[PDB]
Amino acid sequence: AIAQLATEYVFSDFLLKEPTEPKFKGLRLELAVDKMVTCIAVGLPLLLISLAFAQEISIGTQISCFSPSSFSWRQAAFVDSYCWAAVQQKNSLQSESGNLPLWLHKFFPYILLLFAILLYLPPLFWRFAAAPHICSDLKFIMEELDKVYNRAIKAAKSARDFKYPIVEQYLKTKKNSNNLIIKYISCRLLTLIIILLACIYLGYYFSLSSLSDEFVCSIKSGILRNDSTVPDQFQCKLIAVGIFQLLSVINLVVYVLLAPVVVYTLFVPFRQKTDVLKVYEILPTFDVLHFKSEGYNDLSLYNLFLEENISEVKSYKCLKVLENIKSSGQGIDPMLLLTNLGMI
Amino acid sequence: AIAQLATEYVFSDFLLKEPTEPKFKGLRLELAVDKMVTCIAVGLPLLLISLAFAQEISIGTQISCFSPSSFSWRQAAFVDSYCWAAVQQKNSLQSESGNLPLWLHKFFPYILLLFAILLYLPPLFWRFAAAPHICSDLKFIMEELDKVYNRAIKAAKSARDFKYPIVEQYLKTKKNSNNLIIKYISCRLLTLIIILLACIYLGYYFSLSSLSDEFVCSIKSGILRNDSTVPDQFQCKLIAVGIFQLLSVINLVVYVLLAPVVVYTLFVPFRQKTDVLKVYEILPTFDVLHFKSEGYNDLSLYNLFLEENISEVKSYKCLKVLENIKSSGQGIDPMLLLTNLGMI
Amino acid sequence: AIAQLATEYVFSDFLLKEPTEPKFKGLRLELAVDKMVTCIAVGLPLLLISLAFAQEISIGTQISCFSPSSFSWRQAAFVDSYCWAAVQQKNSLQSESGNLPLWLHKFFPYILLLFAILLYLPPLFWRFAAAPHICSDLKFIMEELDKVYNRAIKAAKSARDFKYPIVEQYLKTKKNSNNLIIKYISCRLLTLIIILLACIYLGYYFSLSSLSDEFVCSIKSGILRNDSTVPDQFQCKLIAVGIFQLLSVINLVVYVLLAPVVVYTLFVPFRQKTDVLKVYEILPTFDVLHFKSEGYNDLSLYNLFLEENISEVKSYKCLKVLENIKSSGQGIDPMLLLTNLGMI
Amino acid sequence: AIAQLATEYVFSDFLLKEPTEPKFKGLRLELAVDKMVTCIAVGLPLLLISLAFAQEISIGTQISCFSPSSFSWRQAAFVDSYCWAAVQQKNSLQSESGNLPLWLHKFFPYILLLFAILLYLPPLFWRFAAAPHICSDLKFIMEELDKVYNRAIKAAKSARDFKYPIVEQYLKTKKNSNNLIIKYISCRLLTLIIILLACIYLGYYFSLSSLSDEFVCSIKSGILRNDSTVPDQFQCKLIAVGIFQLLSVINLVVYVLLAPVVVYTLFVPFRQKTDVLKVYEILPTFDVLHFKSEGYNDLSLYNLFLEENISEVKSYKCLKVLENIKSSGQGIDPMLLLTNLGMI
Ligand SMILES: CC(C)CCC[C@@H](C)[C@H]1CC[C@H]2[C@@H]3CC=C4C[C@@H](O)CC[C@]4(C)[C@H]3CC[C@]12C
Ligand SMILES: CC(C)CCC[C@@H](C)[C@H]1CC[C@H]2[C@@H]3CC=C4C[C@@H](O)CC[C@]4(C)[C@H]3CC[C@]12C
Ligand SMILES: CC(C)CCC[C@@H](C)[C@H]1CC[C@H]2[C@@H]3CC=C4C[C@@H](O)CC[C@]4(C)[C@H]3CC[C@]12C
Ligand SMILES: CC(C)CCC[C@@H](C)[C@H]1CC[C@H]2[C@@H]3CC=C4C[C@@H](O)CC[C@]4(C)[C@H]3CC[C@]12C
Ligand SMILES: CC(C)CCC[C@@H](C)[C@H]1CC[C@H]2[C@@H]3CC=C4C[C@@H](O)CC[C@]4(C)[C@H]3CC[C@]12C
Ligand SMILES: CC(C)CCC[C@@H](C)[C@H]1CC[C@H]2[C@@H]3CC=C4C[C@@H](O)CC[C@]4(C)[C@H]3CC[C@]12C
Ligand SMILES: CC(C)CCC[C@@H](C)[C@H]1CC[C@H]2[C@@H]3CC=C4C[C@@H](O)CC[C@]4(C)[C@H]3CC[C@]12C
Ligand SMILES: CC(C)CCC[C@@H](C)[C@H]1CC[C@H]2[C@@H]3CC=C4C[C@@H](O)CC[C@]4(C)[C@H]3CC[C@]12C
Ligand SMILES: *[C@@H]1O[C@H](CO)[C@@H](O)[C@H](O)[C@H]1NC(C)=O
Ligand SMILES: *[C@@H]1O[C@H](CO)[C@@H](O)[C@H](O)[C@H]1NC(C)=O
Ligand SMILES: *[C@@H]1O[C@H](CO)[C@@H](O)[C@H](O)[C@H]1NC(C)=O
Ligand SMILES: *[C@@H]1O[C@H](CO)[C@@H](O)[C@H](O)[C@H]1NC(C)=O
């Protein structure tokens, strides 16, 4: 039913499932905006496919040819099925709009499924190629941040009663390499191109005259070519073509609204803001150097992933509340850190 | 069946599922009134869609055109399907009420699903954008309250046998920022606007003459335009239109009753009452300062979320019972706190 | 099938599911009588809806109009569907009993579902508004009782080898407030009113002549108004109306039997008997004062909830067996308590 | 399918599910004979309902009226559905056996479901009212028996290298109260009465002439009353009536065989034999006094429940093997108990 389809595709965790494995425990591995874009671009065409053939919206068979009254039920069924299979056969049918509109009307669900698959492909390539590496690197970075926070609080407590910036060096090295950012931009660009092509196709499909679904059909090949009792042609109409056009314009609207989001996603350096690591600069055990901005490198992408999935880090949360309290400046950062006692 | 739909949509945890993740363990992340509003506004139109096409209420096909007796079964089926697809084609049909009523009668389930999706969108935006931040902040606040309660009871026990207000400073800082409250008000306002538009549409749909479902249909395009055996027109009726109107007025009543709730929700500062933190003011380790009221800021929203999901805090429950006992004043707050022995 | 519906709605845990959350572990949060009343009042109309359209009891379509023999199958189907949709349209049909009986016959499942939803609403309001508070308070009370029992047995063992009545003070304070009892009485009263209205409706529906299901139908609007081959009217009958009346009288009987139960529930103070706390009065560490009776206050409701869900408390069970043994008076209460050794 | 129904209702744990809660861990809370009686009396009529309308045994529709050849398919369908709905309407039909046989033939599944529900009601009342109390009491009794066994074995080991009969006093007190036994006897008696009424009904249904399923039907009310082309009456037959009678006699046989079991159950004191507590009399720490027999009191019912669910007690099992070995008398009870070393 329509409501069942809605529950499956919008109100359920459709493509929102976290990786089912212990390797990525709590790691999104995909930005929220990218996940939203993929979920829409994939589950919208599927939802429209399901809707267009819902038991309520669908009168019945997808084509009716209006055989003569003399024709029996199965003769008329032969006519309808023959014309359905003959939309491909150009000789059999003669339609003013041509045969491409008939092909599109017959295979619209296939085309929507193709677009959905093509849009799901780049996210899958990301999740299967560049996701494990960033997952491992980000897990190491979070562990290093937790360890340095613990060491700093232990030092502060000892004072009240190595020291090498490994994480900073690793981030600096990431500043050079750009394979991950190149893959990310390539997959986003392919998604954008697929969306644009889908918009072109949907606009063309919705621009039809709405009468191209009606085509003339001739069961006059073979032994029936010279038969007399059979009329030379029939009036066939492809039902649900109006529904297809409505859903196609809906998908076109959604995709044109979505494309600016993908374009904004492509410009990762601009998105790289609100320095996540700036909060850690007040730790004595952490060097006061952010050095993450203004670069078409994997460093900006790592900064984005950190700003996305750093809320799970207790040390980061503690430092963030310390920073927020520092806005008033009533107290002192080391005193607040010592009082917090948030090692684990 | 009707009962199955009821069990799925009203008697089950439809959209009442808690976040399936360890990050939010026991945190609602959504006020009870907001959750009720979203659940109604989403699962009502879906329930009505399912009901309108239930196997019992539905006689059968959604349109019957009453072809002549001479017409065969599949000729009549062609007529019915053609008219169903031609509700869009204005030339084919001539109805007194126009063609918009026919469009609405055909696509009412789609319109209800659209309203449900549009009403579910703002809650989803909230849960995916502003929910993680408030979850982390509120978890930190609850942990700080538990820790300060434990410290105060330990101090009392030591007396019987830092001290910095970090949580108060954090709340004071939240008094300034307003991004969360702005997002909350924006999503509530969008929900209200969607509800009002849905009410307008449902009132228009229910105001129809009830005879607009009957339209005249002409299969007279193409080779059949000059055919003689076919009548110039047919009498088609869209079945289930009365059911659609009944369910639409039901949804209109529900939404007009719900809109005052959304308006009351918009006025969060008025809702900010029954100070949750007032109970903690009797703790020696906690400063006697509430400072949370009369502000279009995130502080009021945080106060609401606390008053919602603070019952899970053992320290808060203990302080609440101490406060309630203090109404008589027979005993002493520190003595009762020491006797309680409710560290964990 | 009928047996499947029975298993789902009477032999299964339909609305008998305990709260699926760790917050309420073993707490009913709903009295047994109230749960029985809600389960009946909700799952009876749903069961009757399912039964009335069971594949065995149902001959087939819900209306047959007996078109002339000259009419084709789909002409007759058009007639039947038109009349089904025209039960609303007063002009189309002319029935002796009127049009309200036809509306009721068509929408009886909707009306039963409406009554079920309206009866499920007050229980849901209770469980979502007043259940968390009573759950927290009752959990605290049980924990306090366990702790005082442990302290008393420890004192007795020490003798053989604070002391403040916090729980008693909390109960005394609850004696004043009445918001929970007011909500309980309001929800019970609304349930009673809904049940009475349902009884009125079912009595009216069952009082019909049983021939109102037969109505005269006229497909004579539009181009067919002046058509000659079509008869001026048809004889239509709404099938399953007898089944609807039978099930409606069954529901009426059940609801009239149930209403006295709801009225008895409304009088909570009378139900407040068999003092649960009287057993704890023999503990040296517990003050000898019950002070819970004869009040339209939340104290009586808390006493009811205690008498309901106190069997899970080992200390209460031990004190109950001590009390029962004290009926003979052969031994001594402190000696029996010491011998029991039931700390945990 | 038939085999699926069999698997669900006889070969599966239909109504044999243990209470899904930690409160009753391993406690039957229902005697084996009572559970068997309830399972049969409930799942037999449901199984017969399912069988009577199985896709294999069922030819098709439940009534066929044999309309004239001139009648079209949907005219005949109208006739059949009209007569199906008119079995209630006495004026419409004229049958030699009357109208009650037709009512019974139409609503036999409803009557079987009613009997199943009425037979399931007393067991449900028991499980929801008197089951928690007996569960708590019996758990306490088993814990006391385990503790006294442990104390006795510890004393024996100490000798080789309070003392109050709390459980005996509790059982003696149970000797007085009779509310549980009264409820048990009342529910068993109601089950017996329901079974007898079901037997009466099934005997009456099976005693029919087998031709009462054939009734004369007249679609001659309304505009068709004076119509000429329609015959004055039709020959309608209610299919599956023979299957209903066969299954009804099967159920009658099962229930008449079952009723003696219920009568034997009612006489609980006679069932109270094979003293379970007699084995514990050899323990030095346990007083040598059974005092459980010859009483219409809850003590006999508790003895039955003990004899039912005491096999789970390791101490009871050890004492039972000691008793069995004592039949030969080769050894000594205290020596065997010391050698067993079965504390836990
Ligand atoms: C997904 C991508 C590939 C879709 C590409 C656009 C498709 C949908 C449409 C839009 C415009 C279309 C073209 C419009 C006009 C003509 C001229 C005609 O004589 C042959 C077909 C041809 C050449 C069409 C082929 C298909 C076409 C290119
Ligand atoms: C992503 C955005 C830009 C998509 C917007 C949809 C645009 C591309 C659509 C809307 C209407 C469409 C046109 C409608 C009709 C025709 C005439 C046909 O003989 C050739 C294709 C052509 C010229 C279409 C090309 C694509 C088109 C211009
Ligand atoms: C969800 C929102 C967009 C719904 C907006 C209201 C819709 C349902 C209805 C209510 C009143 C309607 C209008 C009423 C009157 C007219 C004048 C007519 O000559 C053209 C259509 C037009 C202009 C209608 C368009 C659709 C309309 C605006
Ligand atoms: C949220 C609340 C205010 C909704 C209440 C429903 C209101 C808006 C509905 C109920 C009846 C409706 C009117 C019914 C009939 C017409 C005539 C038509 O030619 C234009 C629209 C118009 C004028 C409708 C406008 C909207 C309307 C006034
Ligand atoms: C659930 C509640 C609202 C149901 C209320 C009772 C319903 C079922 C029935 C019972 C008696 C009925 C009334 C009986 C008589 C008349 C007089 C007639 O000229 C108009 C309808 C009217 C006024 C009926 C309206 C509907 C009615 C009130
Ligand atoms: C909860 C209890 C009291 C419900 C008992 C059912 C009662 C209320 C039912 C049973 C028969 C019913 C009556 C049957 C017939 C008519 C005639 C009609 O023109 C007006 C309604 C009226 C007068 C009904 C009113 C309600 C009624 C009296
Ligand atoms: C479950 C219980 C209520 C069933 C009771 C027995 C039912 C099945 C049957 C068995 C015998 C039957 C009775 C036999 C004879 C007559 C005399 C006739 O002129 C009216 C019906 C009446 C009075 C029957 C009513 C229904 C009846 C009582
Ligand atoms: C539990 C045991 C005793 C049930 C045995 C079934 C008995 C009660 C059945 C079997 C045959 C039945 C009888 C068959 C026929 C008739 C004639 C009818 O006009 C009145 C009922 C009457 C007289 C039935 C009464 C009940 C009956 C005697
Ligand atoms: C049909 O008859 C025509 C007559 O002109 C002939 O040319 C043609 O070959 C025939 N077709 C078949 C399939 O026999
Ligand atoms: C139908 O016949 C008419 C006669 O006036 C002619 O004008 C029209 O073109 C014909 N239509 C078709 C589709 O051949
Ligand atoms: C039907 O014919 C009658 C003849 O009196 C006329 O009044 C009426 O307008 C016609 N109806 C239609 C819909 O053409
Ligand atoms: C049918 O015709 C008879 C002729 O005697 C008449 O008495 C009766 O009222 C008519 N019935 C209807 C429903 O018009």
From Swiss-Prot, chains A, B, C, D:
Pfam families: Innexin
Coiled-coil features, chain-numbered ranges: none
Annotated positions of the Phosphotyrosine modification: 170
UniProt key word Cell membrane: yes
Record annotation: effect of changing residue 73 to A: No effect on voltage-dependence. Altered anion selectivity with equal permeability for iodide and choride
A single GO cellular-component term on record: endoplasmic reticulum membrane
Transmembrane segments: 40-60, 106-126, 189-209, 238-258
Side of membrane Extracellular, spans: 61-105, 210-237
Described purpose of this protein according to its UniProt entry: Ion channel involved in a variety of physiological functions such as blood pressure regulation, apoptotic cell clearance and oogenesis. Forms anion-selective channels with relatively low conductance and an order of permeabilities: nitrate>iodide>chlroride>>aspartate=glutamate=gluconate. Can release ATP upon activation through phosphorylation or cleavage at C-terminus. May play a role as a Ca(2+)-leak channel to regulate ER Ca(2+) homeostasis.
This protein's record includes keyword 4Fe-4S: no
Entry-listed glycosylation sites: 226
Modified residues (S-nitrosocysteine): 39, 318
Designated name of the protein: Pannexin-1
Subunit structure: Homoheptameric.
Topological type in the membrane: Multi-pass membrane protein
Main location: membrane
Record key words, sorted: Calcium, Calcium channel, Calcium transport, Cell membrane, Differentiation, Disease variant, Disulfide bond, Endoplasmic reticulum, Glycoprotein, Ion channel, Ion transport, Membrane, Oogenesis, Phosphoprotein, S-nitrosylation, Transmembrane, Transmembrane helix, Transport
UniProt subcellular location: Cell membrane; Endoplasmic reticulum membrane
Disease affiliated with this protein: Oocyte/zygote/embryo maturation arrest 7: An autosomal dominant infertility disorder due to oocyte degeneration and death, which may occur before or after fertilization.
One MF annotation (Gene Ontology) recorded for this entry: leak channel activity
Family statement drawn from the similarity comment of this UniProt entry: Belongs to the pannexin family.
GN (gene name): PANX1
